[PDB]
C-alpha cells in the first residue's frame, strides 16, 4: 500500500496441473535485482578497437582473421531486464519432472512485476584513511521503468552471450547496460593480393548517412516508480507451434519397410539375406538387390558446407550448419570433431559456473541426437547407377555441397537447461525463416515485450553543462522482479516395454559437483533439453 | 449372423457419380487372403550379414560400398495387411477413365474389414511314403487382429520392397511378416587410408544402450475372432492436398512474354527477330538483347549434385534429387541416362509379372515430364554478365552445386499405377519435409491405422518351455479383406482445340501381354499416372 | 455369443488417468493359459521323504538340519489361477512411469474374467513308429470353474515358490497344481545327547486325529463352462492402506536437531564443534557433550538375533528379522554380508530367467535402505553412562538382542518389481502382525478370492472302479484369462532443488540383456519399487 506496507510476495515455485492429457506448467520466479547508477546519461556512438588476436601482419595469410571483434554500438543509460532462459523460471529438478512427463511443450501466458523498490545514496565521509561509507534511503528518489509493448525499439533481447537474470535464486543480480548495434561496415577482403595469399582491408567505418537513433525516452511511455510504487506489465498471450522433447534416432535407413530376411538359427548365427526380392529401386540398377538403393520417400539430414565463414558487410560471421552427432563417427576421443554445429558456453559465476574469479565452458557436442548425422566430407557421388561399377573417373569423393533439398527433413537443437533462449523474434522479411539455430520458440507476431529500467538522476546542487557524473549523486537501487510463465504440454504415456535408459545426466560427470561447496560454489547441471527416443516416422 | 451365415459381399468394384464439376469416386476392394500360421511367436532382435556383392578387398577402392544389406531388424510373429498401393483399389481401366476425366485428385474417407475367417488344421498320417495331409475345420481357433489407430506403433507400411496385397483380384494374396528397424550404427570410411584409396569399417553394431522395443500385444488393443465372426476398422477421414493428374512441359523459357518477332512470309521461312526491343535483363547486359537473360519472376526445376551417397550412419544410403526427363538430351537411345531421379521396380508374379520363377524389371524412365529438366553437368557459372565476353577465367563448366533456392519451383512424381504408395506419413521433426519423392498424397495428422493379424498359437497337449515350433499345431486361416476408399476429384474440361494425342500406353510394348495367356499370365500395363499435358504459369 | 461367437477382447495395457493430484492407474492384463488335464481326480494324502542334504549321520553336529524338506499335503485334482504378483500386471516400463510419478500407491479394485474356452482331445493313432497324435475340438466338453469368494478354502496363493502367470504376455502360461498342508509334527531336537553335540530326531508323522481335510466340490459352487461360455468374477473392492514408494536414509543421528557448529573458512577446512552446548543428555553425562548421547523422541531400527532358526513344530523355519542394507558396513566386496534379511530369488523361464534349461539367480541385497541398519553383533550395552569412562567390565560386545520395542519406527521392504506379493491375507489370530517380511499390502477383511479351474474328466466307455487314468481320454483346454485391477495413488511432486541421481537399474547390470535374443530369450529388470530418497521425520 503505502510507504510502510509491502506490495509483492516473493514467490518461487513451479506447480505441475494434470488434468486429463494436459499438463499446464505454471513457473513462477523471483529476483532480487541490484540496480547501479549508471555510466552516464548521454546516448553515445562509437565504434571499436579491431580486437585482439587480429592479425597485423600477413603470415598466416588472413586465417585468423575469423577473429574480428569489430563494432560499432550506441550505449544507451538504460538497463535491460530479460528473463528469456531457462534457469531463469525452472530449477533443475523441476525441469527433469518436465522433461519425463511431457512430450511437446507450449508457451501460452506470460506476466512481470517490479515491487518492493529500494533507493540508497552513498555518501563518503572520512580522513580519506577511514572514509567511511554511509547510506541514506531516498523516499522521494525515482526509478523511470519503460515496457517496450509497441515492438519499436531494436529487440537485443536474445541470450548470446548469457546477459540474463541469474540461475541460482537466492544470489542477487546486476543488470546489464542495454545497447545496440548501428550500421557499419567491416569488409575483409582475405582473396587479393598476388596468387591470393594476401588478405586486405576493404571498408572499415560507421556508415553516417544512414543511421537510425532512437532513444528510449521518446520511443516509448515511462513510468517513474518511487518506493511505495509497484509495476505490473500486463498479460501477455504467446502465438507458437509446440517443440519436441524427445530425440530422434532414425536415418533414412532405419525409417521404411524392412528388407526380407529368413532368421537366424541358433544364437551364433546372423541370419541372411534374400537375394532376390521385388521392389522399387533408382537407377538402371537391379541385379544387386539391396537396401542402400531402396527408393524412400523423404531423406533425413543434409551436407552443408561445415563452417563456412561468410565476411559479409560488417565482418565475418558464421552460418550453423545443421545440429548432429559425432558419435558414429567417433572412432577414437582423442579427436575432438567439432562439426556437428557443436556449442561451447562460456559461462559465469552467477551462472552456474562454481569457482569465481574463472570461466567454465562447456561443450555441447549433441552425442544423443544421430541419423541426422551427414558429413560433408565422407559422402559422394555418382555420374551413372547401375548394375556396374563405375571407373575411376564418375565418382567424386570431397564435396562439400549444401544438400538441403525439398525433400529433407531437420531437426531443431531443442531447448537446453541451464543456458538457452525461451523464445525469439522473426526478422520480419519476405520468406520468414522456417527454424532456429538456437531458441526452440519463435514468436509469430511479436515478442513478449522488452522491460528497460533506468534509475532516475539525482543531481548535485551546481548543475554544469560540462559535467557529467561529478554533477550527479551516487545512487543504487534494488528491487524485485517477479515474473510468471504458463506452460501448457501434452502427457508422455510410455510407448515400450523395457526400461528407460538414459545416461542419467552426462557421464563423464562426479556428482560431488552439482551441490554446495564448504563456500556454496556449484555448478548447474546441463540438461540435454530433448531427451528420451522417439519413432521420427 | 451365425457358423452358418456368412457376413460380408465379395464386392470389387468401382463408382464414378458425376455432379456437377466434382466427381466422386468409390473404389471397392476385396481380396482373398492366405495367412499362414508363423515363424515362432517370440519377438527377436538380430543383426544380418554385410551381404552380396559387398567388397571383401580393396581393389575398387570403395565404390562398391554402394552395396550394403546390413540392417538390425526386431521380427515379430504378426503379419501386415497394408491397402497401401494403386492396384489394390483400381483396375486398369477404371484408372484411365479416372486419369482422362479429372484433374486433381484427393483423398477423402477410407475403411477396412475381415470377414469370412476360415481355419483350419493340416494332419500328417502315413507311412512317410503316401503321408495324406488332411485338412479339420477348427471352430474353435481364434484370429488376433490388431489395428494401431493410436499410431503407436512403428508405421512401416509404405510400398518400398512392394509388399502390399497382389492387385488381381481373382487369385490369393500370401501376407508378409512383420518387423522394424531397431537403432544400429553402420558406418563406411570410403576416404581413409593413405591416398584416400582405402575403404575402412568403422561402426558395425547394434547399440544396445538404446533400444525402443514395443510389442504389438501392450501396446494396442487385439480383438479375438472366432470364425463366426467379422472385424470392421471404422470410418477414417484424411486431411490431406488435392495432386496433379497432369505433366507441365515448362521450362523457365517457355514461361513468360514472347520475345518480340516479325512473323515470316511464305512456307519457307522463319521469321527473324527484332534486333532492338525493350525490357529487363540482367547484367550490365544491354545491346546483345535476348530471352535467355530475360528477368523472369521464377525458376524452374534445379540443379542437384546427382546420385549422392549419403554414407549416414546406419550406411550408405541415395538422396533422391529431382524428377526429370532425359528426353531432351537423350541423343543416341544406346546411351541409359539414369540420372532423372529414375526408379526401376522389380516386381513379383502376383503384382504384375507375367512369367513366374523371374523377376520382370520395368524402368520409369519419366519420359512425359519435362522443362523440369536440369542436368547438373550441362550447367555453368560466369563471373560477370554484360556486353563483354568472359575470357577462359571467370567462366566455369563442371559444377554438380545444388541450385535449389526461395525462386525454385518443382514437381513430384505424381501417382504412378501399378506401383506406388497412395498415402505416407510425414515425419515429425522442426520442418517438415515440403513434398516426397513418391507418394503423392501426405497424412498431416496420422495414417489411417495399420491392421495386424496373427493367427492366434495352438499348442500340443505337451507344452515344454524349451520348445518352439515342435509344441504348436500347424494351421493356416483364409479370410477376406475388403476395404472401400472414396475418392473426391475435380472434372477436367477440354482447354484445348486440337485432339490429345498420348503416346498411349508406353510405345515400345506389345499388345499380346497384359492379357492372360493360355496359362493366365499377364502383365500389368504401366499407367503414367500424370497424363495429359497443362500450362504451368 | 454362441459357439462361433468370441466373448472377450484380449487387452494387455495400462491407463494412467491423473486428475489433480490423484493419479489413478488401470492394469488390464490377459495371458493365454495351458490347461492340461490333471494326475488324478482322486484327493491324496501322503507325506514325503526328508529331503536332500539331510545329513543321516553326526558329523557336523545337526548343523545341516536347516535342510529339511519333510512335509505332508493333501493334493486335489483342481488347478491354481493366481494374479498375485506385479509383472502379473504391469510390464517394466509402466512400473517405472509409476514409480517415479507416484507417492503412495493403494489398492482399490480388482476384475477377473476367463473367456475363449478352447477344449481338445489328443487321438493317438499309428504303428507305434509313426505314431500319429490327432486333435479333435470338444464342444460338449466340460471345464469346472470355481471361485472361493467365501474365504474358505485354504489360501495358499501366495507368490512364495513363484507359482504365478508368467511375466511376459505372449508366451503361454501352464499352470500349477493345487495343495496345502495338513496338520503334521516334523520335531529335530539339534541339542540332544552327551555335550549337546547329538541331534536327534522326536517326532515325525501326520497327525491323523485331527485333519482338517475340505474338498473343492462341497466347499463352494462350480461353474460349469462349455466352449462358448465365458465366467466373470464380480467386482472386488480392496480395504487397505497406502504403501511408500520412497525409500528412508535417516538414521536416528540424521533425525533431530543438529548439533550447534561454527562454519569452516575456506575450502579446505572442516569447521568445528561448540565445546559448551545446551541440551538434554542421557546419564549423568554432561561435560562430553555430544550428538551420540543427544536424547531423541524416537529409535529408527532395531537389533535381531539374526537368521533365527525357529526348530518349532513341524520343522525348522527362520524368524525374517529386519530389512536393511550393509553398505555402511561393506568394507571389502568379497564377503557377502547377507544378513540384512536379504533374499534371493531362483527364477524360472517364463519367470524371467533367459536361458531354458537352468536356473538364474537374483540376489536381493537393499542397497538403497541404509539407516534402518543394526547389525546385532556391532552393538553394545554398558552399565553406568556418566562422564567417566567404564571398566572392562560393565561393557559387553557381542549381544543378539532384540531391540525391538515401543519406541522403534521400522520399513518394510516394499514393493518388488519382478517378484512379489500384491496383496496377502492376515492371519486370523490375537494381535494380528503389524507389517510383513515380504508383501507390501495386507487384507483387512478378505483376500480377493481365489479362483481355481479344473478340467472335467472325460471318460472312455468302460468305466473301472480298479482304474484311474486308463479310465479317462487325455484332453487340455486353452483359455484366456483377463483381469483388471485399479490403483489409486498419490501423485509425486519434486521437493527438491538438485537433480534425482539415481543408480539407474542396478548398475552391474549389462543392458544387452533384458532385450530379445535371437531366439528372443529375455530376462526382466528387477525393479527396487521403493527407489527415490524421502525426509523419514
Known sequence: SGVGHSTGNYNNRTEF???????????????????????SEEYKIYDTDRGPRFPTDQTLQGRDTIN??????????????????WGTWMNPADFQQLTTTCREVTLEHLDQTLDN???????????????????????????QVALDKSNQLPWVADNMYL????????????????SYHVNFWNTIDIISGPQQNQWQQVKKEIRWDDLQFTPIETTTEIDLLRTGDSWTSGPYKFNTKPTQLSYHWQSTRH????HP?????????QGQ???????????????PMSAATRVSNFHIGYSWPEWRIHYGSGGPAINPGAPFSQAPWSTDPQVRLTQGASEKAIFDYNHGDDDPAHRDQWWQNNLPITGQTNWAPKNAHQANLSSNVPSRQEFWTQD??????????????????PWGAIWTKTPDTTHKPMMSAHAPFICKDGPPGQLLVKLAPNYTENLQTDGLGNNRIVTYATFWWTGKLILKGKLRLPRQFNLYNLPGRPRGTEAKKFLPNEIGHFELPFMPGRCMPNYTM
Open 255 to 258: 525409417t521404411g519397410s524392412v
Open 117 to 143: 523498490i529500494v533507493i540508497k545514496t552513498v555518501s563518503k565521509q572520512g580522513s580519506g584513511a577511514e572514509e567511511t561509507t554511509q547510506y541514506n534511503n531516498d523516499l522521494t528518489a525515482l526509478l
Open 400 to 417: 562439400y555441397h549444401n544438400t538441403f533439398g525439398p525433400f529433407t527433413a531437420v531437426d531443431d537443437v531443442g531447448i537446453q537447461y
Open 261 to 269: 530376411t529368413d532368421p537366424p538359427n541358433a544364437i551364433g548365427q
Open 163 to 178: 546477459d540474463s537474470l541469474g540461475y541460482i535464486p537466492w544470489r542477487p543480480c546486476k543488470l546489464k547496460q542495454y
Open 68 to 85: 574480428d571483434s569489430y563494432h560499432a554500438q550506441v550505449e544507451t543509460p538504460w538497463f535491460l531486464i530479460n528473463p528469456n532462459s
Open 17 to 39: 496441473y494434470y488434468h486429463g492429457d494436459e499438463v499446464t506448467i505454471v513457473c513462477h520466479s523471483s529476483r532480487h535485482i541490484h540496480l547501479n547508477m549508471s555510466e
Open 273 to 287: 539375406n534374400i537375394r532376390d526380392i521385388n521392389g522399387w529401386q533408382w537407377g538402371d540398377r537391379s541385379d
